[PDB]
Amino acid sequence: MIQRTPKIQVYSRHPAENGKSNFLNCYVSGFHPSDIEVDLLKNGERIEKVEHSPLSFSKDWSFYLLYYTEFTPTEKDEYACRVNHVTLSQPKIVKWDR
């Protein structure tokens, strides 16, 4: 039996340009077990309406998740990924570093 804490990377698909449409990713990698919750936050509020399913796979004992949503960066909007997992004593919030 193992427990492995996820690595969490938050990044835009392309170089961010204020007012230009883009995608914000959340790659959550190398975790075990597979049960997990991953949300995108905008100004501290949970993004609810995501069109695309996440891409999920295991290799083979680690799990991987790519969660992405369309967005248009602005100067004033702050984004963060929030992850909860058994390996975390409280939810982990990782800010998008633009």
From Swiss-Prot:
Keyword terms, alphabetized: Amyloid, Amyloidosis, Disease variant, Disulfide bond, Glycation, Glycoprotein, Immunity, Immunoglobulin domain, MHC I, Pyrrolidone carboxylic acid, Secreted, Signal
Lineage: Eukaryota, Metazoa, Chordata, Craniata, Vertebrata
Family recorded in the similarity comment: Belongs to the beta-2-microglobulin family.
Ig-like C1-type domain ranges (all copies): 6-94
GO process annotations (BP): amyloid fibril formation; antigen processing and presentation of endogenous peptide antigen via MHC class I; antigen processing and presentation of exogenous peptide antigen via MHC class II; antigen processing and presentation of exogenous protein antigen via MHC class Ib, TAP-dependent; cellular response to iron ion; cellular response to iron(III) ion; cellular response to nicotine; intracellular iron ion homeostasis
Chief place of localization: secreted
Disulfide bridges in this chain: C26-C81
One MF annotation (Gene Ontology) recorded for this entry: identical protein binding
UniProt GO cellular component terms: cytosol; early endosome lumen; early endosome membrane; endoplasmic reticulum; endoplasmic reticulum lumen; ER to Golgi transport vesicle membrane; external side of plasma membrane; extracellular exosome
Location in the cell: Secreted; Cell surface
Protein known as: Beta-2-microglobulin
Main function: Component of the class I major histocompatibility complex (MHC). Involved in the presentation of peptide antigens to the immune system. Exogenously applied M.tuberculosis EsxA or EsxA-EsxB (or EsxA expressed in host) binds B2M and decreases its export to the cell surface (total protein levels do not change), probably leading to defects in class I antigen presentation.
PTM summary: Glycation of Ile-2 is observed in long-term hemodialysis patients.
UniProt keyword Disulfide bond present: yes
Glycan-linked positions: I2, K20, K42, K49, K59, K92, K95
Top-level taxon in the UniProt lineage: Eukaryota
Subunit structure: Heterodimer of an alpha chain and a beta chain. Beta-2-microglobulin is the beta-chain of major histocompatibility complex class I molecules. Polymers of beta 2-microglobulin can be found in tissues from patients on long-term hemodialysis. B2M alone (not in complex with HLA-I) interacts with M.tuberculosis EsxA (ESAT-6) and an EsxA-EsxB (CFP-10) complex; the tripartite complex can be detected in the host endoplasmic reticulum. The B2M-EsxA complex can be detected in patients with pleural tuberculosis and is stable from pH 4.0 to 8.0 and in the presence of 2M NaCl.
Gene: B2M
